[model samples]
Target chain A: FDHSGMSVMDRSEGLSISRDGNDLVSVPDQYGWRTARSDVCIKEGMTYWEVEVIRGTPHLRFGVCRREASLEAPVGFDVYGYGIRDISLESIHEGKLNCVLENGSPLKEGDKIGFLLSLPDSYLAIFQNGKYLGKAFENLKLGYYPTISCFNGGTARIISEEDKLEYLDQIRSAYCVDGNSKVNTLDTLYKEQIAEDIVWDIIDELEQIAL
Target chain B: TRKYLNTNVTPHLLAGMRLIAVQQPEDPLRVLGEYLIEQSNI
Candidate 1:
């Protein structure tokens, strides 16, 4: 998968994103939560990506969100999304913060956070410096896309495409084994040959059985 | 058993409860109570 860029309909006007040097940086134009959602929308499969906190406050929130989620709101600040505030370690949904984990050290510039969304497992988890934090949400409904929310003039950079694809391959290989081997292999093959609708039906059936 | 209130709730509901628990771990019920009052005021 490539980091194609965020969807225009899924981002706030206050959020400005651009290619800076070697990275894609999202900067807030004002002092409110500005959100951006990736163009890639995943209904199934286990996906992973990372974002580097290049220069931002702890109010920066990153996670996954439904397509219908409000672009003006922060990720996880609505029912269609879930996010962890870096400064507070609080999981957010519907504009409320719930401390799902102890308030750990505040995120600073240069900290890299990994986000993993598993459609098969119906959960989302975050990792810091490759250390796994606990699951942020579970039994998630589908139609999620990667998202980042910034507040107080915070800025973050989504990991580069080359590095993102490398991490995604690692996540795929780790989960697409054993019981998932057959379907995993077939999914790639079916993607090119079969119709999109039929392929989804087959994948749905396989997921039911796998679960 | 009061902690069990935080479990088994929907993810969004659980997020609200978790916020309450973190902000008022010693008296999470107060958070709920305050919410009810705020709602009534609204």
Candidate 2:
């Protein structure tokens, strides 16, 4: 599948990516969890993407994570990542189970997990079978790489661009992202929103926030 | 040409924007809105 730019980029150790199905990430070792993040990080605007569960069960998770998130553990196990457990239907953030969500059952092989990010509104909603589930996290970090984790033989893939476009198109009217001339999935991300000096300003404020 | 925002909020917005610049998320609007909300909790 052609992501046109979006695909599994950075990943945790022991996790293997297979072009057998582009963007497919899996865990060959049964030792621990492995996480993978996309190259198209979200900085601004509303957008959506999906992960097709290839090898579900024993362990799998779908969510978003910041750069500081640990690759050694699953995405949602730390403050930097927000995730959902396939087996327990529980949402995770800040390194703990936020709540037991209302999903009917554990995810199975072939299921599709979706993330609808409405950044302007401050929430990341999850989806199943292309339908809205619930807002899994709010007040998210400035940037997020929609991430997925696998254990044992669990696997998943970022659906191709063709599939991604159609889903985002359907909900296009529901959002307003004036900055993007067209939401060509990851096209707008080719440009950067934050300027340089603001970066240095952050450390100043971060130090200030400490007090 | 520099586009400027309110000075009072600029510090914080920049403080927040620093995260975006740092993490480079895929849905920044959502992430930013969330950041603003988190900061607004005063």
Candidate 3:
């Protein structure tokens, strides 16, 4: 309900703001990588928002970052940030690729991705798109602004709200939160209604997405 | 495939494997084992 789009000043020099400015498009193909931040920052409560992947390829990431995070790198490339890559579905933090989420597919144009920041819980969970991926980073501290970055033409747009109530509406009903097992018993997502009820998908061998 | 590993490994163990897979560690066995050791402390 408040200001959500990133202002031009917070964006890296290599990016171009659309004439309408709702979308962020990249420039300077040789810039290697670049990032941008939102107008608002969250320090407490369950602040959830979504981003639309208008266009992008390799380094497209959506996540949150503290003030000091580098705008010249991917969102999750440092300790000040946490991110999930659209190309590989890989969660990242502190310069390391963290994990691959099971439920969601590789993000493409017109796809909406969401993330949640809970300072009280100290975790940032990459979610929305009606798909509960998994928690990407944990033990987070205070104050993080929404962030995104990429190389090439990795364009992205911040979603203004749950508007159609897509993410909200799907969770309030019984749905497959994780794998075949289903649950609807809800209230604050995972903390109360989903704690023990959430089914983590079984995994054995782990594989890379692509090179 | 899921049987043998499912019998002895914790979910965290599998999750750790996926994480390492994403990281492309130089020595994955040692790295994954070290990750478990780190997780053990928590």
In the range A48-105, model 1's lDDT, one tens digit per residue, is 4456566544466776667554656667556666666676556666567765545353
Model 3 lDDT, residue B34, Cα: 76
DockQ of 2: 0.09
User: In model 1, which runs have C-alpha deviations exceeding 4 angstroms?
Assistant: A1-9, A17-25, A56-58, A100-120, A136-138, A164-211, B1-42
lDDT of 3 by residue, A1-211 (tens): 2222233446666665341566665544555665664544444434344566655445566766676546566676666666777655676666777666665545543233333333242434455465554453445523556656766666666655324234543233322233212121111222332122222322223423332
Provide the overall lDDT of each model, using Cα atoms, as 2-decimal numbers: 0.49, 0.55, 0.50
- Candidate 3 matches the true fold with a TM-score of 0.54
Candidate 3 chain A lowest-lDDT run of ten: A179-188
With candidate 2 superimposed using the best TM-score fit, by how many Å does residue B26's alpha carbon deviate from the native? 32
Off by over 4 Å in 2: A1-9, A17-20, A55-58, A105-120, A130-132, A136-142, A165-170, A173-182, A186-211, B1-42
Winning model by TM-score: 2
Docking verdict class for candidate 2: incorrect
> When superposed on Cα atoms, how far off is each prediction in RMSD?
20.4, 12.8, 19.2
Predicted complexes: DockQ each: 0.01, 0.09, 0.12
